Amino acid sequence: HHHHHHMVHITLDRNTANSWLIISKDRRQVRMGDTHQNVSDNKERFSNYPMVLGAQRFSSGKMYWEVDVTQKEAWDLGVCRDSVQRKGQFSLSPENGFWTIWLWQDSYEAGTSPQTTLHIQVPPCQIGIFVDYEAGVVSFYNITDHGSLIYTFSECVFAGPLRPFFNVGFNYSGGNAAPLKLCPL
Template sequence: EAEVQEMIQERRLKIQEIRESVKISRDAADREKAEGVQVFSALMESAERGLKELLKEIQDKQETTEREAEDFIRELEQEISELKKRSSEGDDPPNKNWVEDRVHPPSYEGTVERAVAQLEEKMKKMLDMRRVQQFAVDVTLDPDTAHPKLILSDDRKQVKHGDDWKKLPDNPERFSKCVFVLAEQSFSSGRFYFEVQVKGKTEWDLGVVRESVDRKEILALSTKNGFWTLVLRNENRYSTGEKTSTLFDLHPGPEKVGVFVDYDQGLVSFYDVDAAALIYSFTGCCFKEKLYPFFSPYLNNGGKNSAPLIICPVSQAG
């Protein structure tokens, strides 16, 4: 009988495990459905905006054609009046001029196809942004890592460069030669994402660094040195900071940058958040240490670059 009771207890525990598993599955399904509804609603809104833009483009073309036609008709009527006047006064008519066919009906060929292609591209970008934004994490700046000339806000969400060297302990975590600061949070697995406002700045550095990065020397922002970054210099020179880095043609440049990391897949991506556009991705990275979100507002350059970097709450694209 003791064996029977034990078997009964085992089965009851198994039933409980199954019910808990079903509940977890149901909760996950509910979240997926809610996310699906949000994405679909956003796509419908985007499609509606795309249709309005298409109709406006066609309407604008037609209105332009009608204005050109009215102007041409007025010119021809004026020429007719001039010819009648010359004829009644017995003057010789002017040299015969062929009337130019200056007004052409607008061509709408390909307009719809272009609009659909643009909408599809926009949807793909938006879906990619939503995919990474779901891994948003709360990031705050670590004052123990901040260079002595950096000024952090009380909530540790903003950083800018100041002219005064603050008297701070030269602890091992602090950057002494470069105006860098790290986040308090670190990551050694999984995926994470955060957004930073860069509006009004002419120079900055953003990305992630490995924990063992040298904090007491001047370093190039290279993957060899443990930096995976996006860099702005001289207002419009965007690159990864590597010596051999190509320049990115970003006009206009982003006002808010999203940073996404998939630690296990060795991926670091940078996004223009407002445009829902991928700027650049480091792929095939081999991470073996903790990664920290990394920030540099760069030098304030006499006030020209005094705007702060601001860690923003993430609101989904669309």
């Protein structure tokens, strides 16, 4: 791919974070805390899952960013509608306003309904996310494997402003404490 030149500087929005997340001072890294992080509740915070949104909202153009997933066992990444449900249980699907991939139990899958098996020969340490708003495209790239394509959502019906979407995953195993990090341009 030649998407690097649409690179955008993403920062995390503290106010959207699940109350157990710890976001770094520079708002470029997030990890699961071992307890409630002593913040007030609000209608923006994801309640059920360890999720957080980027601060940036996109309604046009082409945008590209990279996320470090080194040594994580579980995570979700992609984009979502600004108006996604925050409270209670829900599935990650385009019908619910999410365009995502994930790792779970040693398999990678795209957040279609039902979910789609991904074919990744080189487990990624960094993921590139490309959004073309006008074309209705969200693509995912394996930066560890020379930028190889992972998955393309096409004919996307965004139906509103988009925000970068992150899930650090739970850490029941003690093997998933590592952060998500936004990689430098």
